[PDB]
């Protein structure tokens with residue numbers, strides 16, 4: 001069970017059975033800002049269970065994240081894949097993504113279940129409205145005060161520092177470095193550094209130039225998230241070597257994000273250019289291979305169950321409707337991407353041993 005391997009996990013799915021309504025599966029088709037194109041594409045909310053906001057279809061179907069048996073299954077599948085850490089998409093309580101309802105109320109159950117399959121839960125901080133250095137302080141405090149004592153709570157166990165929480169911060173670069181440095185530098189007006197609420201803060205890098213913004217901000221590490229090689233400077237794995245090298249110079253944790261392919265045209269029909277075909281695993285493997293080159297401190301996986309963007313490694317089946325031929329992992333099985341992960345996880349987990357300065361040889 002590899003604890004240096006992280007996977008981005010979403011809890012925002014709902015169905016009538018458990019939530020009393022469909023959530024996220026019944027996703028709207030997001031309109032192009034230019035309506036003179038929006039009108040040449042589908043419109044409105046997907047009407048599940050047959051029609052969902054996804055180019056693939058889950059084994060569990062139109063499932064509820066509030067369904068213990070789903071959480072259980074999910075944990076089990078991550079375990080099969082030998083992932084130790086799920087990076088849970090998080091919004092503050094009474095707050096939600098624009099296409100969902102709130103999901104902090106669920107976290108207690110997700111931890112209990114992560115614990116039950118001896119898995120760990122770190123937090124993937126979404127860009128909630130008015131996110132800044134101030135409410136971030138209030139939320140870190142809430143998160144550790146609320147979930148720190150839970151034996152599922154993830155802490156990067158520094159070989160010989162303190163065991164430190166990790167916070168992945170999605171679209172960090174939105175908040176100016178001056179503002180981050182209030183919270184993330186030692187002498188910042190609201191610094192949690194050297195405090196009971198200190199952690200390892202991970203910033204999304206997009207453009208080459210975000211490097212320097214990230215240093216000025218006070219962040220401990222960087223992650224790329226994006227599954228589409230070519231989309232951003234970060235998500236392009238040819239760049240990854242330079243980001244490792246930079247991260248080494250400035251004592252930053254370089255966490256590359258590897259994805260098994262990309263397709264989001266169920267909800268962003270204009271977004272074809274970033275579609276990547278899975279090539280039955282070849283994409284995913286070239287991604288995980290390029291990540292291992294760098295000899296990274298952790299590796300992140302985009303994603304377990306981002307179904308809208310088609311980055312999910314979770315078990316998916318073939319399905320056909322009156323009008324839709326859903327994609328699927330055929331020729332191979334529902335578990336294909338869990339096995340490709342288990343494979344490369346055990347390879348990473350092993351290779352990572354030879355890295356440490358203490359474990360070198362004559």
Ligand SMILES: OC[C@H]1NC[C@@H](O)[C@@H](O[C@H]2O[C@H](CO)[C@@H](O)[C@H](O)[C@H]2O)[C@@H]1O
Pocket residue numbers: 008089097098099100124126127170264267306308309
């Ligand atoms: O986890 C970070 C990032 N991942 C990809 C998306 O899930 C993105 O969320 C936006 O896009 C989804 C559709 O892809 C949409 O449901 C949501 O409301 C958006 O916030 C997310 O921030």
Ligand SMILES: [Mg+2]
Pocket residue numbers: 158161
């Ligand atoms: Mg150290």
